[PDB]
Structure 1
Amino acid sequence: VEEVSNKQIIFKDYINGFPKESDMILKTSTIKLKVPEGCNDAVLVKNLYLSCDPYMRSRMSKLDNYVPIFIPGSPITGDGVAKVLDSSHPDFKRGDLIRGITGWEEYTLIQSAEFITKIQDLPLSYHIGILGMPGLTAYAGFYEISSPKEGETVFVSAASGAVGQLVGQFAKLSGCYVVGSAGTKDKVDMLKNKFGFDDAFNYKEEHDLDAALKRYFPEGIDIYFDNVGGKMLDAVLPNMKTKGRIATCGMISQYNLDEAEGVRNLFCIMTKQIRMQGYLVYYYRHLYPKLFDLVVPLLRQGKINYVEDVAEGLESAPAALIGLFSGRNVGKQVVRVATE
């Protein structure tokens, strides 16, 4: 039984405002590469990829919190891809590749097993992106929540991100006219060139968001896929069509504010008869087969594209997570901990 070093990213303590790299601490611990005797229904894994996700910011402040907080002194946890080294669980065996909740470290003794699934060709990292939680988020928000119909107009914010880039391609599959906003020229070019968006604009260079939306949506928006909230959401509301739908997926412009911004155009919910509906992807896990059945053939034919941002090494993970809130990532942010 080899006992080896185990680098970990430890959560320091609760924060306010924007997260900093000193809120996460590199610690070198030790681990024996065997499931402990008397420790049952557990899986010991070597972590291969880690996902960086905006919701992780909310785990860094103590609040009624919608996701359980990080524990100070303990490793950051989140979605990852890992290889089973040893198992006391009947459904996992040495060599299996899994996806699910694991530790921000080289090796994790996963004690529940509820939060992991065995990986069924495509890049391993896809299982925490288009074939994982962000892909399921895009599928549930667009197809289940938004009720898209052929010919409808669709606006997507954070459109080059892990979720948004898929929403735009689903909208094209549905025969919709789709526009996205993103924060750099490169992201805007990628929206039109690889994600098949009909148009796109850099919201950071638009001094009048209402005017920008009217450029692209002269007769209004049928479906707004909201990833950002805040001023963008407020500009969208008067530009919705009657009976338009807003899929409230996230509001990343708010996650680092002590006081959330006021949204002032909600009267448009009445005047435009809008259905604004939020959702949490965990309540849609039963749709994973429907996601796979749709996107796996398209990926194989190269008819749907997925762009990832791969940070190299566990030590790069804190900066990769902080970069989400400045738009440093181009596509789905992942961390490569080890090859395998």
Structure 2
Amino acid sequence: VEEVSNKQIIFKDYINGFPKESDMILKTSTIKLKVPEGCNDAVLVKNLYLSCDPYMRSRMSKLDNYVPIFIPGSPITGDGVAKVLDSSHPDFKRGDLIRGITGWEEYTLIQSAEFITKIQHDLPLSYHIGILGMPGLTAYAGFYEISSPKEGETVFVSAASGAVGQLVGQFAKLSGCYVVGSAGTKDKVDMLKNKFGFDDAFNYKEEHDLDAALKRYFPEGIDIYFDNVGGKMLDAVLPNMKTKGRIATCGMSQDEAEGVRNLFCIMTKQIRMQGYLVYYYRHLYPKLFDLVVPLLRQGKINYVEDVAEGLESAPAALIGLFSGRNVGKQVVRVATE
């Protein structure tokens, strides 16, 4: 059996300030390319793609646990695409491509096996941690399952250039809705309208009065607000909601949180604001695939990712995501197939 080096991105220690590249350290360990004997229901994988997600910043502080905390001295963990090298688990074989929670390393011994799933098939492998993965399912559940979209309704999407937002907007146009998105750069604003079919889009940092901005695009209010940021943007959105409007709380800019002062609009506008966790909607994966996979090949839905090259660039890619410098879904390619 081969014994190879296993480069790893180790989590240094819990922090209190803004995360730095110094909080992760590249460590070259070793591993034998076989599931240990006596280790049953385990899967040894080689990691190909790693997901950089915004929820992972909270895992870097001793906050005790919406999302489980990073263990210092251990590798970073998160969603990814991997290839099964060996398995003591009946539902996985050599050469199977999987998606789920793996280690920020070249090779991982997944003992759980419950948080990984066989990849169904033609399209780029990295799509299964994006439009065909948890971000896609998140967009599907927040828009179709929770927001109850009707044709002709008005939709506003915050952080629209991200993986979730860019799919919500395309879902909105498919349902015949007028959709507007907000983003942080001119290139993202242009990308939202030139590639994702957004009816309009604006740069929320060049607009100092956000109420005037939303009135400009929604002269009669917003039916559906897909909330990726919360905070100040949600406060500006609340008085601009239509009666019986709906807010899908997918994520939150939130170390003191911005006070939200317009929640009386929940009553005066009769808003239904609903939060959700994508993990509670795994049963909708077939509906997502059955919808997006045909139109992905029919070229009516696009998807933009930001691929960092090599495991060594994963720290820089993560903090760049924390700093909003990513363009689309941030991804680290650890190895080719």
Q: TM-score range by the shorter chain?
A: over 0.9
Shift of 1:234: 0.7
Once the two structures are superposed, residues 16-47 of structure 1 have per-residue CA deviations (whole angstroms, 9 ceiling, x without a partner) of 23211111111110000000010001111110
Shift of 1:330: 0.5
Tell me the distance in 2 between the aligned counterparts of 1:232 and 1:17: 24
Once the two structures are superposed, residues 111-131 of structure 1 have per-residue CA deviations (whole angstroms, 9 ceiling, x without a partner) of 010000111100000000000
Whether the 8 Å CA contact 2:320–2:326 is kept in 1: the answer is yes
Once the two structures are superposed, residues 276-331 of structure 1 have per-residue CA deviations (whole angstroms, 9 ceiling, x without a partner) of 11000000001101110110001011110000100000011111111112211111
Residue aligning to 1:115? 115
Tell me the distance in 1 between the aligned counterparts of 2:182 and 2:16: 28
1:70 aligned counterpart, secondary structure: coil
2:226 aligned counterpart, secondary structure: strand
Residue aligning to 2:8? 8
Shift of 1:108: 0.2
Shift of 1:176: 0.2
- The answer as to 2:17 corresponding to 1:17 is yes
Q: Which runs of 5+ in 1 are unaligned?
A: 252-257
2:245 aligned counterpart, secondary structure: strand
Alpha-carbon distance change, 193 to 103 in structure 1, aligned in 2, over 3 angstroms: same
Whether the 8 Å CA contact 2:59–2:70 is kept in 1: the answer is yes
1:285 aligned counterpart, secondary structure: helix
Tell me the distance in 2 between the aligned counterparts of 1:229 and 1:309: 24
Residues 157-176 of structure 1 mapped to structure 2, 5 A cutoff: 157-176=158-177
Tell me the distance in 1 between the aligned counterparts of 2:112 and 2:65: 22
Once the two structures are superposed, residues 48-78 of structure 1 have per-residue CA deviations (whole angstroms, 9 ceiling, x without a partner) of 0000011111111222521110100000000
Q: Among 272, 278, 281, which residue is 1:281 paired with? A: 278
1:204 aligned counterpart, secondary structure: coil
2:259 aligned counterpart, secondary structure: coil
Tell me the distance in 1 between the aligned counterparts of 2:183 and 2:127: 22
Once the two structures are superposed, residues 229-266 of structure 1 have per-residue CA deviations (whole angstroms, 9 ceiling, x without a partner) of 11111100010001111100001xxxxxx211111111
- The answer as to 2:192 corresponding to 1:195 is no
Tell me the distance in 2 between the aligned counterparts of 1:61 and 1:286: 32
TM value normalised by structure 2: 0.98
Once the two structures are superposed, residues 162-193 of structure 1 have per-residue CA deviations (whole angstroms, 9 ceiling, x without a partner) of 10000000000010000000000100000000
Q: Which runs of 5+ in 2 are unaligned?
A: none
Once the two structures are superposed, residues 66-116 of structure 1 have per-residue CA deviations (whole angstroms, 9 ceiling, x without a partner) of 111010000000000011110101111111111110000000000010000
Whether the 8 Å CA contact 2:57–2:322 is kept in 1: the answer is no
Tell me the distance in 2 between the aligned counterparts of 1:325 and 1:265: 27
Give the % identical residues.
100
Residues 125-144 of structure 1 mapped to structure 2, 5 A cutoff: 125-144=126-145
Residue aligning to 1:231? 232
2:243 aligned counterpart, secondary structure: strand
Alpha-carbon distance change, 9 to 226 in structure 1, aligned in 2, over 3 angstroms: same
Tell me the distance in 1 between the aligned counterparts of 2:7 and 2:297: 36
1:205 aligned counterpart, secondary structure: coil
Alpha-carbon distance change, 274 to 64 in structure 1, aligned in 2, over 3 angstroms: farther
Tell me the distance in 1 between the aligned counterparts of 2:232 and 2:257: 11
2:163 aligned counterpart, secondary structure: coil
Tell me the distance in 1 between the aligned counterparts of 2:70 and 2:279: 18
Tell me the distance in 2 between the aligned counterparts of 1:287 and 1:20: 36
Tell me the distance in 2 between the aligned counterparts of 1:81 and 1:228: 27
Tell me the distance in 1 between the aligned counterparts of 2:75 and 2:206: 39
Shift of 1:210: 0.4
Whether the 8 Å CA contact 2:9–2:76 is kept in 1: the answer is yes
Tell me the distance in 2 between the aligned counterparts of 1:58 and 1:283: 21
Residue aligning to 2:45? 45
TM value normalised by structure 1: 0.97
Once the two structures are superposed, residues 110-159 of structure 1 have per-residue CA deviations (whole angstroms, 9 ceiling, x without a partner) of 00100001111000000000000000000000111100011000000000
Tell me the distance in 2 between the aligned counterparts of 1:143 and 1:183: 26
Moved over 2 A (4+): none
Tell me the distance in 2 between the aligned counterparts of 1:13 and 1:315: 19
Tell me the distance in 2 between the aligned counterparts of 1:58 and 1:270: 32
1:82 aligned counterpart, secondary structure: strand
1:48 aligned counterpart, secondary structure: strand
Whether the 8 Å CA contact 2:132–2:289 is kept in 1: the answer is yes
How many residues are treated as equivalent by the alignment?
334
Residues 1-340 of structure 1 mapped to structure 2, 5 A cutoff: 1-120=1-120, 121-251=122-252, 258-340=255-337
2:205 aligned counterpart, secondary structure: helix
Tell me the distance in 1 between the aligned counterparts of 2:78 and 2:164: 17
